[PDB]
Design a protein around this ligand. Sequence first.
Ligand SMILES: Nc1ccn([C@H]2C[C@H](O)[C@@H](COP(=O)(O)NP(=O)(O)OP(=O)(O)O)O2)c(=O)n1
Ligand SMILES: [Mg+2]
Ligand SMILES: [Mg+2]
Length: 342
Amino acid sequence: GSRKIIHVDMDCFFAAVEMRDNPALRDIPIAIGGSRERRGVISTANYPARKFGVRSAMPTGMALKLCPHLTLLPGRFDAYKEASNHIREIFSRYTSRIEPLSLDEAYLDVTDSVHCHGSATLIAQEIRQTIFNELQLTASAGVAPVKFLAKIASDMNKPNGQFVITPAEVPAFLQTLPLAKIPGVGKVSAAKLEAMGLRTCGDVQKCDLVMLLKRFGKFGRILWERSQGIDERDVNSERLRKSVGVERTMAEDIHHWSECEAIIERLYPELERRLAKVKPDLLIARQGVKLKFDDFQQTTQEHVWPRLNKADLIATARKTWDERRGGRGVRLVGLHVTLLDP
DNA sequence: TCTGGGGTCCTAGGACCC
DNA sequence: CTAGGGTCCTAGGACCC
Ligand SMILES: Nc1ccn([C@H]2C[C@H](O)[C@@H](COP(=O)(O)NP(=O)(O)OP(=O)(O)O)O2)c(=O)n1
Ligand SMILES: [Mg+2]
Ligand SMILES: [Mg+2]
């Protein structure tokens, strides 16, 4: 039969949090990101800032050119994590089939429920209302027979709204639905599709799957599927974090290896703590290092390793710095571990 | 404007053992 | 009648939040 998926997405998450915890903001253009001297980027802006065209992933200086009297906050992640924990707890009250995607997003599966007589509409409605009650903070939601359509639905009545797609409304919805709205279809893909001539799902509904498979491979057949309205993916409930990293971007490029080693030594204790929380004994399936150069090119050097240790990371780093650097300076130094299957 | 810090999933391409 | 060609790694892209 038809499944019942709800996707929930907080509104302007970080900015919403700083707004609630300080309404002295609330009406000024603010953004969470790094400082311009520290070569930072906008993590998120509120609507008064977006008004000036300030977006997430935008370099901070650019956001400042668009909004000089922007109020930039560094971030308070433990609070965001508190809110995430909270809304997840709320999600549980209605179902066990919950797949978190981030601090502020999740998929919920509710096709087997008595909570609103089967009304995904009313359960979503509730969830949002109690998020506003308990957390004093808004939320938007989408409802659909499949994941990606619930994702797309949760945007369509944003902010503090919800939207519901029924199996009856799907082909109508799909005929004029732009490809760039489907998750996983970013600007590169959305360009290749333009050259190919594809803009709506309805355009893909009438092409040749052999072609998409030849020019896109996987996440090419997916497009054909989603355009036909198929997404047989399921809420995972026990999806676990496969990797953990810690990386730092410096205010000035470094050109001395001593600087690099020093930075690795400042970063490792932080890779320690975070690892000592999924595996307090220090797992490792693989470990590795990351260098970003002045020309904004990066390289990662990882390998199979038994257990987390600094010496191997510094060896690998001294080697990555002597073999891939090419006289360049480095803006970013990073540490990284992959984790085991169980 | 001069571009973060976390992560996900795919793929090419090399290297090694058979 | 000095394997080649298949596996399994690593590096990197694209995308997500
Ligand atoms: N590039 C990005 C995008 C998201 N994030 C963080 C900041 C956001 O508050 C949070 C939520 O992701 P998001 O839903 O895409 N953005 P946000 O909730 O602020 O906007 P809306 O969902 O209301 O449109 O992730 C980030 O740090 N870097
Ligand atoms: Mg989001
Ligand atoms: Mg959001």
